[PDB]
Every structure is written in C-alpha cells, then in structure tokens.
Amino acid sequence: TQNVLYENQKLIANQFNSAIGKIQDSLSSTASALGKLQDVVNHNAQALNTLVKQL
Amino acid sequence: TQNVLYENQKLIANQFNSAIGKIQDSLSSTASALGKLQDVVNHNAQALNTLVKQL
C-alpha cells in the first residue's frame, strides 16, 4: 500500500511539474509579446509626433 | 492513517485540477487581449501611414 501511495505521489509530482513547464512557457511568451507591443507603440507615437512637428 | 494519506492525495489532485482550469481561463483571456491590441495597433499604424501618404 505504501508503494501505491508513493506511486500516486510521483504521478501528482510529474503532472504538476509538466504543468509548471507549460505555465513558464506561457509567461515567457506573454513577456515577449508585451515587449514587442511596447516597442511598436512607442515607435508609432514618435512617428505621429514627428509628423505633427513637420506639418 | 493510510486512509488519511489517500484522502489527502485526492484533495491535492482536486485542488490542482481546479487551479489548472482557472489558469486556462487566464491564458485564453491574455491571448484575446493581445490579439485585440495587435489588431488595433496595426490598424492605427496603417491609418497613420495612409495619412502621411495622402498629404
């Protein structure tokens, strides 16, 4: 019975670790996307500002 | 005692599955928001470029 309990513990730990890996991937992807959006937003803000200053 | 161990394992599994469902919700919402931001940023970039070209 103790072996069964230890095997259930290993199951839970394996599933949890896989979930954590997926969540880490999602965090990194969200960070990447936010960074790209920040870059483009600020670039286009500077581009509207330049247009105003050159009109 | 072994029954306390097995019920604890079931509790752990149920709480884990609940958390995973909530995390899936959060992931879908994040993707939706990033998609809307992408669409609007590109729309406004194209609008600014069309303005520049029309002048």
């Binding site: 979930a19 997926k22 990447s32 | -």
Partner: peptide, 28 residues
Amino acid sequence: INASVVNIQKEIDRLNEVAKNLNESLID
C-alpha cells in the same frame, strides 16, 4: 516617418495552445 506594424501571432498561438494543452496535465 513610417509607422511599423506588430506581429505577435506566435505568442498568441502559443498561449492558446497551452490553454488547450493544460488538459493533459490534469490528474486522473
């Protein structure tokens, strides 16, 4: 004075894929 477009479709697709794949991490 050119405006740039953003392309984060990779990140969006991966987020949706994980939102689907987490079903596989559920404990039976």
